[PDB]
Design a protein around this ligand. Structure first.
Ligand SMILES: CO[C@H]1C[C@@H]2CC[C@@H](C)[C@@](O)(O2)C(=O)C(=O)N2CCCC[C@H]2C(=O)O[C@H]([C@H](C)C[C@@H]2CC[C@@H](O)[C@H](OC)C2)CC(=O)[C@H](C)/C=C(\C)[C@@H](O)[C@@H](OC)C(=O)[C@H](C)C[C@H](C)/C=C/C=C/C=C/1C
Length: 122
């Protein structure tokens, strides 16, 4: 499995589950609205905290605008259209010491599957 470090400290590590368009490297760019599916779980307890797959509602955000946690901007920036990946995001690139509400404690390593479906620009 194609497995790579997206930050030099190993804080964001991506394993490719299914290769996308690697032949033509069809990759989104900063500012593009991206459409993905995802599932997120805590590495510590294994608890799944969210799944757009189970909702069956694809998730949209603008890439590299700080709309999402840094490890996501870094991860999705590296994905080819139709790629499915597993990404491990250390707390510094996630929610840090604060965590996120009742579902994500402080100092949490996060594991997400992300599937890049589509992207667009105005
Ligand atoms: C119901 O489900 C939520 C998503 C939930 C929230 C809580 C968590 C556990 C989680 O379960 O997703 C989760 O799985 C998670 O950790 N995610 C979601 C998928 C992307 C990665 C991560 C994340 O960054 O969430 C994000 C995290 C929770 C908060 C941000 C982290 C980065 C930091 O820089 C931001 O500060 C600004 C805050 C939430 C989001 O991905 C969304 C889309 C973005 C916003 C809320 C903020 O960026 C915001 O600015 C204020 C905006 O500018 C936006 C686009 C305005 C529009 C109208 C709002 C859309 C809201 C959609 C929210 C929905 C689908």
């Amino acid at each position: 499995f194609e497995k790579v470090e997206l930050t030099a400290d190993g804080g964001v590590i991506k394993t490719i589950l299914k290769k996308g368009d690697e032949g033509e490297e069809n990759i989104p760019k900063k500012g593009n609205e991206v459409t993905v599916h995802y599932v997120g779980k805590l590495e510590s307890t294994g608890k799944v905290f969210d799944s757009s797959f189970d909702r069956n509602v694809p998730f949209k955000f603008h890439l590299e605008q700080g709309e999402v946690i840094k490890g996501w901007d870094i991860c999705v920036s590296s994905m080819r259209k139709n790629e499915k990946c597993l990404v491990r995001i250390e707390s510094m690139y996630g929610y840090g010491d604060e965590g996120c509400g009742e579902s994500i404690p402080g100092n949490s390593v996060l594991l997400f599957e992300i599937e890049l479906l589509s992207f667009r620009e105005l």
